[PDB]
Amino acid sequence: DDIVVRQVDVGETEQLMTFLLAHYYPEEPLTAGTHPPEPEAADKEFLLSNVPFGTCFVALHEGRIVAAVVAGPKDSHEPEHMAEEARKYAGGKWGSILHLLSAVETATDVCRRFSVPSCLHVHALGVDPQLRGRNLGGRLMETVAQRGRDLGHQLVSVDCTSVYAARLVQRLGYQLINTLRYVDHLDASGQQVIRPPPPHESVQTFVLHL
C-alpha cells in the first residue's frame, strides 16, 4: 500500500491549495469557463474554510499531495446562503461561479428533498493524473463518506462539473438528481454565466444515502 490518506490539518492548507492550483482548478469547468483563469481569493478561502471541520482529506505519496477532496456540511439554509453569496460577489469570477452553484443548490435542495437534517457536500476533488492505478478519487470519496457516517450525516452530495467525476460517483453508487446545461443557465441580463471549453456541457448533481 503505496498511498497514505489523511485529514488535512490547518497548518497544511497552503500545501493543499498549491495542489489544487495545479490539479483541480486549471481543468475545472467553472474556473475554465469564467475569466480571469486564476481563482479569486474568496474562492480559495471558501474551500480552505472547510478544513477546520475535519472533512477535507489528502492522499500523500513520498511527501507530496497527489489527490485532495474538500467537503463540508450544509443544511436547509444553504440555498439562501448561496443566493446571498452570489448576490454579494456579482460582477466577478467567484460571483459567476456562485451564480451557477446557487442555481444548482436551490434546484436540488437536498435536505428537504431527502428529509434529512444535514448533508456532507463535496466541493472539490482533484487528482494528479500522473500517478496511475491507485484509485485515488474513489478512495478519497469513500473516506468522505466514512467521515460523514462518523459525524452522523445521512447524505453525501456532489456537483460533478466534469464527466470523470460523474463516472466516478456513478461507479460508487451515487444517484443522479439534477442536470443543468451551461448553455441553459443565464443571468438576469440574459448572459450565459459559465462558458467552458469542449467537452463540458452540464453540471450533474449526485447524492449517496448513508
The grid coordinates listed for 161 are 462539473
Please give the backbone phi and psi of residue 15, each rounded to the nearest 5 degrees, phi first: -65, -40
Between CA 45 and CA 120 the distance in angstroms is 19
Q: Is residue 169 within 8 Å of 160, Cβ to Cβ?
A: yes
Between CA 23 and CA 164 the distance in angstroms is 14
Q: Is residue 90 within 8 Å of 126, Cβ to Cβ?
A: no
Residue 159 labeled ligand binder: yes
Q: Is residue 148 within 8 Å of 142, Cβ to Cβ?
A: no
Between CA 158 and CA 146 the distance in angstroms is 15
SS (H, E, C) the chain: CCCEEEECCCCCHHHHHHHHHHHCCCCCHHHHCCCCCCCCHHHHHHHHCCHHHCCCEEEEECCEEEEEEEEEEECCCHHHHHHHHHHHHCCCHHHHHHHHHHHHHHHHCHHHHCCCCCEEEEEEEEECCCCCCCCHHHHHHHHHHHHHHHCCCCEEEEEECCHHHHHHHHHCCCEEEEEEEHHHCECCCCCECCCCCCCCCEEEEEEEEC
Residue 133 labeled ligand binder: yes
Terminus-to-terminus CA distance in the chain, angstroms?
Answer: 27
The set of residues, in sequence order, having a beta carbon less than 8 Å from that of 21 and lying 6+ positions away, is 39
Residue 18 labeled ligand binder: no
How many CB atoms are closer than 10 A to CB 109? Answer: 14
Residue 171 labeled ligand binder: yes
Between the alpha carbon of residue 167 and those of residues 9, 117, 151, the distances in Å are: 29, 28, 26
Between CA 152 and CA 132 the distance in angstroms is 33
The set of residues, in sequence order, having a beta carbon less than 8 Å from that of 119 and lying 6+ positions away, is 73, 74, 75, 110, 111, 153, 154, 155, 156, 157, 207
Q: 68: which strand partners?
A: 58, 126
Q: In Å, what resolution does this model reach?
A: 1.8
**4-7, strands of its sheet edge to edge:** 4-7, 57-61, 64-74, 119-127, 155-160, 202-209, 175-181
User: Which approach determined this entry?
Assistant: X-ray
Residues 44-62: b if buried by 16+ CB within 10 A, e if exposed: bebbbebbeebbbbbbeee
Residue 202 labeled ligand binder: no
The set of residues, in sequence order, having a beta carbon less than 8 Å from that of 165 and lying 6+ positions away, is 125, 137, 158
Between CA 137 and CA 142 the distance in angstroms is 9
Residue 27 labeled ligand binder: yes
Residue 137 labeled ligand binder: yes
Residue 152 labeled ligand binder: no
Question: Angle, nearest 10°, between helix axes 41-48 and 13-23?
Answer: 120
Rounded-to-10 torsion of CA 167, 168, 172, 178: -50
Q: Is residue 174 within 8 Å of 207, Cβ to Cβ?
A: yes
Residue 2 labeled ligand binder: no
How many CB atoms are closer than 10 A to CB 165? Answer: 21
